Amino acid sequence: DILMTQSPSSMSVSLGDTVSITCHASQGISSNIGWLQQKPGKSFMGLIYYGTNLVDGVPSRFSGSGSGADYSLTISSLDSEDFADYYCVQYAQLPYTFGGGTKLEIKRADAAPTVSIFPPSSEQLTSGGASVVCFLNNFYPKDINVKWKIDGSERQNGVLNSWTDQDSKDSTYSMSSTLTLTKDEYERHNSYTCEATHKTSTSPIVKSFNRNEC
Amino acid sequence: EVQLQQSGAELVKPGASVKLSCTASGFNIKDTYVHWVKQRPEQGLEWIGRIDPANGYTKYDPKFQGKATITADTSSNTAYLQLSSLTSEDTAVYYCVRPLYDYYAMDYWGQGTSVTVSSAKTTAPSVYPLAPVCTGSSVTLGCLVKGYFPEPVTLTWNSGSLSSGVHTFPAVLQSDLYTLSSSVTVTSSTWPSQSITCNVAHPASSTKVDKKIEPR
Amino acid sequence: GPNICTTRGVSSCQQCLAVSPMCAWCSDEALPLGSPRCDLKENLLKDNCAPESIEFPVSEARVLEDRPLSDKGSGDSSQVTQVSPQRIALRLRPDDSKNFSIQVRQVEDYPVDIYYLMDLSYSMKDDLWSIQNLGTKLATQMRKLTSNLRIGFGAFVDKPVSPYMYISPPEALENPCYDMKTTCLPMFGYKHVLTLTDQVTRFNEEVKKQSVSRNRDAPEGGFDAIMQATVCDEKIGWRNDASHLLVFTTDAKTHIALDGRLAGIVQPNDGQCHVGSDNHYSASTTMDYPSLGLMTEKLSQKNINLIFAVTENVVNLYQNYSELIPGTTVGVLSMDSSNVLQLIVDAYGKIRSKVELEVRDLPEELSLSFNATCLNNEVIPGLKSCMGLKIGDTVSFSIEAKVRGCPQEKEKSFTIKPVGFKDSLIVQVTFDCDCACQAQAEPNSHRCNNGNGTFECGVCRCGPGW
Amino acid sequence: LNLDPVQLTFYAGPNGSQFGFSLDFHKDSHGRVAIVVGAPRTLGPSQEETGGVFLCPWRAEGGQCPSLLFDLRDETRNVGSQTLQTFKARQGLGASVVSWSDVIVACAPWQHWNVLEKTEEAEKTPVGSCFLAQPESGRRAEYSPCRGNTLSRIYVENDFSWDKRYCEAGFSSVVTQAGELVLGAPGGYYFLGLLAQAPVADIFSSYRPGILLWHVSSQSLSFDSSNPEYFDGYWGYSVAVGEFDGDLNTTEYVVGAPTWSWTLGAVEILDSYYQRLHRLRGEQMASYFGHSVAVTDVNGDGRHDLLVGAPLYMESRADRKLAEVGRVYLFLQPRGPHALGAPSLLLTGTQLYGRFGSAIAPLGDLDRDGYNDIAVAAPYGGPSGRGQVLVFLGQSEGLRSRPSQVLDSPFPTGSAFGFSLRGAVDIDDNGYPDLIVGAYGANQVAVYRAQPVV
Ligand SMILES: *[C@@H]1O[C@H](CO)[C@@H](O[C@@H]2O[C@H](CO)[C@@H](O[C@@H]3O[C@H](CO[C@H]4O[C@H](CO)[C@@H](O)[C@H](O)[C@@H]4O)[C@@H](O)[C@H](O[C@H]4O[C@H](CO)[C@@H](O)[C@H](O)[C@@H]4O)[C@@H]3O)[C@H](O)[C@H]2NC(C)=O)[C@H](O)[C@H]1NC(C)=O
Ligand SMILES: *[C@@H]1O[C@H](CO)[C@@H](O[C@@H]2O[C@H](CO)[C@@H](O)[C@H](O)[C@H]2NC(C)=O)[C@H](O)[C@H]1NC(C)=O
Ligand SMILES: N=C(N)c1ccc(N2CCN(C3CCN(CC(=O)O)CC3)CC2)cc1
Ligand SMILES: *[C@@H]1O[C@H](CO)[C@@H](O)[C@H](O)[C@H]1NC(C)=O
Ligand SMILES: [Ca+2]
Ligand SMILES: [Ca+2]
Ligand SMILES: [Ca+2]
Ligand SMILES: [Ca+2]
Ligand SMILES: [Mn+2]
Ligand SMILES: [Mn+2]
Ligand SMILES: [Mn+2]
């Protein structure tokens, strides 16, 4: 099958910028390529077909180009609606194959995360479970690493992470990490820590608590 | 106007079968090719196959040969996608697609049909309050919704009152059951000065529990 | 007493004869002033008119050639007589009429040419197999009717051009049946195979080497082949004195004039021969199919009896074409041509079961009428054709020619010929309107107003210029 | 009656180009009348016949014309694991031409087409194709509704149902006043014949170069049939439009099928959904009844009347003999919802093989008496066989039975003078409608100007 290598995976840009998404096929497809758009939490819309032809209804600021096995999607003067996912698809050969996708994100000034750790509730402990939650709210860029430590030693088993899309207001990101243990295992230890590694600081942002003590 | 209207979200068990539909609106289904595409967060987009509803001839990606079965009924102006011997990996969003002008293109898309394969029974969530530990100018509370099925759940604070400065994170699948959390931030003079409640509704099992956040 | 001859009061001998066929003129000098010169021949002699001075032509009809009808069409270098008499002299005075007869015989043991023109599109594959001995079989049966048989063979499919012809892949051009599990010939329009010959085993062996081709559309290019088989005299080899049977076999519809435009062909058929040394029709891809009218013209011109030997799925079609092409015969061919032998024999009989008179070059002022005697001496008035005849039978026609007034030209000749026949009756007509005494007229006679007139036939006539 | 046969205007194309095979009047966006001329054997780039089109400005002196350029290159697209192919050699571009608004439609009925997929193929066949141009703007588009990507094996399995591979779309053409292009495709559905219709506006907006296979959603094709009466009928050999159902909002199609029902021939009147309203059957087999059709109100009652040509009709004569001369049939439309009865008038040719009725052109009202008139071609008529065009004038009871004027070909033998005709347009702006006559055999077109009645 024809491999469609789409790049970049994502880009941080602002309104009015002129950006370009590229797509590389494993072989020549002679302009038999289409470009697609998927706005956040919605279906797909056709942008380009046969390499350069605009789908009916699409703005003229969109434009396709390229030949052989290398093609490009260009958006002159980004609009607030253009921030979305973009995929390429080849139909030179069956089976049709798609690119990895490209997400256009809103660029802004860097911002360190607001970390907050939360021990297991009383209700959960009485049921036989124990979940330590760690919120990392409002930061930029999106790249962040969370690390759980029990009595100072790292823990990787039983961690559950969740991220939010770029916020509509401040264009920041947020993350929720949850370490779930049994009641019995939770009481074998005392110190519970979550370390946040962000580019806004060489030193990891640490938050923690001690069991029993408060 | 050309619109592709697909069936509602399906919720089935593994080993079973399901048949999604794609009804043409504002045009004849018989006019063009009708394709089916599978989307997953990790694996991304994958082409299942196509059908020419004018004669019923079909093409398939050899990956989907066996599970996928595309058909069409020009009478009801509808195309179908049957999936058999369902598996957790068949959990994906499925779109029906047709071209605009170019015979071979992929221009018009349906809204997409959500499929979820699971053996989980209708389980109600476990709502846990998340109060901070025993300082600053800003305080942050939380609420943990754990072990519910199926999706979704609506989470609000003080019954929709406290809306700004809130982060309800997407649900995550934890062993056939879903887990969700939500944080909220205010000033120190607000809490515990003012009562903050975590309202969670799960229409599936028909349960609307509410937990007031209490300090430690 | 007086009559139309005298009461008309004519001025000359010529005018006298123009009154009525019964009128006569007396050119005698010794004739009373009161006595008319234009009267019945009896009345003139009654008035002591000199017999030599009596001008009274009589309409007659005498034979010049009267060869006896042949008992056999065999032998001879075509000294066979089918019509009798062959030539007669006819004399008519103004507004008169004379009658004569003509005999026509369907002579026994007359030579026969049979050219077998065959559809060789793919459905005729089994047909080829069943006629592999037709030459000898046909020889055996025709021997009962004639001692001079010649037979030949030609084949057709359709115009070798898209869309009639498959043009892809390249293999399909060399072998149209490539996508099947057999081989067939490349497509051909019309090809002559065997010139008419009395060596009938040549027919058998040529046929055994023939094979079918394959084209796309049901209608075929047989009418192209009929035209060429007709107008290519020397190549097909039709004999001058022989019955010409063109046996057209097919199991499908046929292309007609103006169909060619679907192949981008708009040039009308020119009705000329276009089969060269390679024996293929070279104008197949550049010239349109012929029209029924043009086909009719050439068939008639070359005395070809066309036989539509077609399958039951298209007999109605060709029966209707047959009605638009007079002289054409239709027979029902089996799906494998297994019955084509008897079809041809029955056709040959039907062809020679009719005698139909035709007139050529008849003057405007002459009109003819016919009385047929078919069967056993049964007269049939107002009829110039006989049917239901058998070989060896003889019929006769009584003919009467009626001239209107008198024409300028005093000598003309026309022809009475049966349709398809070689021999004919030539009628040499002479219009006797003048008097003999006019040849000895006296211009500027001193008997006529001091030289102001001409003296002819015993009377004075106003000279030229008056 | 009042066409001027003394001072003609001659336009000419390249030798052997068949310049004048088809023609029409063309008005630009300013109302200026020109003459579009098709030349289906014009040489292309590879020194091979491909056909061509010429747009002749009006000049009393005539002369040479500039080319209306179209892409003559064969196309190839590798897509969907298939290979699409167009073949323009001997395609016959300009075998038909028609003008509507400021747009020209020129067709190549014999353009071939094939689709390759590994070892299989669709088969190389004349689907035909139409080229559209807006001369003033330079806009170009194409329309080829019979192109497909089904492989040969499939047709064989389904007994060749809906087989549009040999359509020859554009064989005949016409455009409704509303701007709907209607193409005749006599080879459609395995030579039954079909019609293809689509708005000109949608042809342009849906076309892109290099696609070769694209959808025109607003298009409408006629239907296949299992009735043997239609087999090899060449339905769409000729086409025309008019108002025959009493509903001015609807446009009815007139279709010629000259070999319908085992060469009996027929003409049918349909609604825009190809539902049959009437059928006129031929009088004589092989006469090619329906070779040409014409629509115009000749008796001035506001109701369109129908003329049908049967150029090969054999007239009965003395001694049970037939003579191919050609014949034209006039059908007057009755008042209100009623069927077209027997012909109101029969016009029959005189010259043997003259092909009277090969072409029939509405002239509008030539002598300006309130009745529309027509011209009938006999491309091989006249005492010399060089060709004649005969004018018949309208009247309260239909048409006159005798011609008001006869135009003898000014060209040599074989010119096919009158094979194409077009009237009802005042090209010199003198208030009288004029006549253009094609003579593709001579590669020329003659223009006859109408003058005040004498
Ligand atoms: C070869 O040539 C023959 C001769 O023309 C064709 O046969 C004729 O075909 C036409 C069309 O099918 C027939 O038309 C119809 O006539 C009927 C009345 O006919 C009677 O009288 C004849 C006299 O011999 C009888 O044999 C016959 O049995 C009938 O009793 C009408 O009732 C028909 O009318 C209906 O259909 C027409 C359309 O066809 C409508 O317009 C009418 O409104 C009505 O609904 C029709 O008029 C004709 O009868 C046939 N004649 C004969 C003698 O058979 C062949 O078709 C032709 N074949 C080929 C392959 O070319
Ligand atoms: C054809 O036969 C008719 C008889 O039906 C002939 O006409 C008759 O001729 C005789 C002459 O002997 C007249 O007495 C009759 O009055 C005629 N009858 C008619 C005219 O009805 C006619 O002469 C014959 N023609 C030929 C050429 O032989
Ligand atoms: N109903 C429709 N559209 C339809 C109508 C008719 C058809 N056709 C089916 C195929 N027929 C061929 C068979 C092979 N022969 C080989 C030969 O003679 O060489 C040439 C004729 C022609 C008619 C298809 C479809
Ligand atoms: C002319 O007619 C008469 C009357 O029937 C007949 O006796 C005579 O034989 C005819 N002439 C010829 C040459 O047969
Ligand atoms: Ca209407
Ligand atoms: Ca009218
Ligand atoms: Ca008039
Ligand atoms: Ca004028
Ligand atoms: Mn055949
Ligand atoms: Mn057979
Ligand atoms: Mn054929």
Domain boundaries, chain B: 3-117, 126-212
Instruction: Report whether A21 contacts A37 (CB < 8 A).
Output: no
Q: Is A150 left (phi over 0), alpha (psi -120 to 50) or beta?
A: beta
Identical fold between A4-106 and A114-210: yes
**What superfamily would CATH give domain B3-117?**
Immunoglobulins (2.60.40.10)
Check CB contact under 8 Å for A30 and D77: yes
With CA atoms as reference, report the closest residue to C155 among C131, C138, C178, C175: C131
Q: How far is the CA of C296 from the centre of ligand 10 (A)?
A: 28
Tokens 């006769």 correspond to what residue?
Answer: C396
The tally of CA atoms less than 13 A away on the side-chain side of residue C143 is: 9
Show me where chain B is broken: residue before each gap, C-N > 2.5 A. 134
Method: X-ray
Q: How far is the CA of A85 from the centre of ligand 4 (A)?
A: 113
List of long-range contacts for D221-225, beta carbons under 8 Å, 24+ apart: D221/D145, D221/D164, D221/D194, D221/D195, D221/D196, D221/D197, D222/D188, D222/D194, D222/D195, D222/D196, D222/D274, D223/D194, D223/D274, D224/D161, D224/D162, D224/D163, D224/D189, D224/D192, D224/D194, D225/D189, D225/D192
CA distances from B5 to B80, D24, D329 (A): 12, 47, 54
Residue C125: CB atoms within 10 Å: 15
CA distances from A75 to A20, C27, D12, D414 (A): 7, 124, 52, 62
Distance CA C275, CA B37 (A): 63
Beta bridge partners of D421: D437
Nearest by CB to residue D211, choosing from B31, B57, B102, is B102
| Residue A63 DSSP SS3 | strand
CA distances from C359 to C59, C82, D234 (A): 21, 17, 42
List of long-range contacts for C372-381, beta carbons under 8 Å, 24+ apart: C372/C397, C373/C397, C373/C398
With CA atoms as reference, report the closest residue to B200 among B130, B124, B132: B124
> Following CA atoms D48, D49, D50, D56 in sequence, which dihedral angle do they give, to the nearest 10 degrees?
120
- Structure tokens belonging to residue C241: 């004195």
| Residue C348 DSSP SS3 | helix
CA distances from A45 to B8, C272, D238 (A): 20, 67, 44
Contacts of D210 in chain A (CB under 8 A): 31, 50
Protein residues within 5 Å, CB atom, of ion ligand 8: D 426, 428, 430, 432, 434, 450
Q: What Rg, from alpha-carbon coordinates, does chain B have?
A: 23
- Structure tokens belonging to residue D310: 């049967």
DSSP per-residue letters across C158-192: --SSTTTS---SHHHHH-TTTTTTS--PPP-SEEE
Tokens 């002196």 correspond to what residue?
Answer: D61
Query: Which sign does the torsion angle of CA C346, C349, C353, C356 carry?
Result: positive
Angle between the C340-351 and C134-142 helix axes, to the nearest 10 degrees? 40
C20-48 residues labelled b (16+ CB within 10 A) or e (exposed):
bbebbbbbbeebeeeebbbbbbebbeeee
Documented resolution in Å? 2.0
Residue C178: CB atoms within 10 Å: 17
CATH number of A114-210: 2.60.40.10
| C282 is annotated as contributing to ligand binding | no
Mutate to test the interface with D, among A1, A30, A52 (most CBs of D within 10 A): A30
Side chain identity, residue A209? F
With CA atoms as reference, report the closest residue to C102 among C88, C89, C116, C119: C88
CATH architecture of the region A4-106 = Sandwich (2.60)
Tokens 């093989």 correspond to what residue?
Answer: D353
Identify the DSSP state of B62.
G
CA distances from C297 to A55, C258, C301 (A): 64, 18, 6
Distance CA D268, CA C45 (A): 81
Cite the beta strand spans of A76-144 per DSSP E: 85-90, 97-98, 102-106, 114-118, 129-139
Identify the DSSP state of B123.
B
Work out which ligand 1 atom sits closest to the CA atom of D285: 61
Cite the beta strand spans of chain B per DSSP E: 3-6, 10-12, 18-25, 34-40, 44-52, 57-60, 68-73, 78-83, 93-98, 108-109, 113-117, 126-130, 138-148, 154-157, 166-168, 172-174, 177-187, 197-202, 207-212
With CA atoms as reference, report the closest residue to B98 among B150, B156, B36: B36
Contacts of A50 in chain D (CB under 8 A): 208, 210-211
> Residue D440: closest CA among chain C residues belongs to which residue?
C266
Instruction: Report whether D349 contacts D371 (CB < 8 A).
Output: no
Instruction: Report whether D298 contacts D347 (CB < 8 A).
Output: no
| Residue A123 DSSP SS3 | helix
Instruction: Report whether D192 contacts D231 (CB < 8 A).
Output: yes
Instruction: Report whether D257 contacts D233 (CB < 8 A).
Output: yes
With CA atoms as reference, report the closest residue to A70 among A26, A13, A40, A20: A26
Q: Is B71 left (phi over 0), alpha (psi -120 to 50) or beta?
A: beta
Instruction: Report whether C367 contacts C83 (CB < 8 A).
Output: no
Instruction: Report whether A107 contacts A172 (CB < 8 A).
Output: no
> Following CA atoms A51, A53, A58, A61 in sequence, which dihedral angle do they give, to the nearest 10 degrees?
70
Chain D interface includes A166 (CB < 8 A):
no
C432-465 residues labelled b (16+ CB within 10 A) or e (exposed):
bbbbebeeeeeeebeebeeeebbbbbbbbbeeee
Beta bridge partners of C447: none
Distance CA B23, CA B4 (A): 6
| Residue B82 DSSP SS3 | strand
**What superfamily would CATH give domain B126-212?**
Immunoglobulins (2.60.40.10)
Work out which ligand 3 atom sits closest to the CA atom of D161: 3
Nearest by CB to residue B132, choosing from A49, A53, A118, is A118
C89 Cβ below 6 A of ligand 3: no
- Structure tokens belonging to residue D183: 């193409």
The phi, psi pair for A50, rounded to 5°, reads 50, 40
The phi, psi pair for D178, rounded to 5°, reads -75, -10
Looking at chain A, the number of H-run helices and the number of E-run strands are 2, 19
Instruction: Report whether A160 contacts B178 (CB < 8 A).
Output: no
- Structure tokens belonging to residue D192: 């039954």
Identical fold between B3-117 and B126-212: yes
Reduced 3-state DSSP string for chain D:
CCECCCCCEEEECCCCCCCCCEEEEEECCCCCEEEEEEECCCECCCCCECEEEEEEECCCCCECCCECCCCCCCCEEEECCEEEEEECCCCCECCEEEEECCEEEEEECCCEEEEEECCEECCCECCEEEEEEECCCCEEEEECCCCCCCCHHHHHHCCCCCCCCCCCECCEEEECCCCEEEEEECCHHHHCCEEEEEEHHHHHHHCCCCCCCECCCCCEECCCCCCHHHCCCCCCCEEEEECCCCCCCCCEEEEEECCHHHHCCEEEEECCCCCEEEEEECCCCCCCCCCEEEEECCCCCCCCEEEEEECCCEEEECCCEEEECCEEEEECCCCCCCCCCCCCEEEECCCCCCCCCCEEEEEECCCCCCCCEEEEEECCCCCCCCCEEEEECEECCEECCCCCEEEECCCCCCCCCCCEEEEEECCCCCCCCEEEEEEHHHCEEEEECECCCC
Nearest by CB to residue B44, choosing from A94, A96, A98, is A98
Question: Which helix (H) or strand (E) segment is A34 a member of?
Answer: strand A33-38
CATH number, domain with residue C209: 3.40.50.410
Q: Where are the alpha helices (DSSP H) in C263-310?
A: 292-301
> Chains A and D: how many Cβ contacts under 8 Å?
20
C101 Cβ below 6 A of ligand 4: yes
Distance CA C34, CA D348 (A): 62
Identify the DSSP state of B189.
T
Cite the beta strand spans of A60-190 per DSSP E: 62-67, 70-75, 85-90, 97-98, 102-106, 114-118, 129-139, 145-150, 153-155, 159-163, 173-182
C382 Cβ below 6 A of ligand 2: no
CA distances from B3 to A54, B25, D143, D160 (A): 19, 5, 26, 33
With CA atoms as reference, report the closest residue to D388 among D330, D444, D445, D349: D349
Q: Smallest CA–CA separation between D212 and chain A, in Å?
A: 11
Instruction: Report whether D89 contacts D49 (CB < 8 A).
Output: yes
Check CB contact under 8 Å for B47 and A174: no
Identify the DSSP state of C466.
-
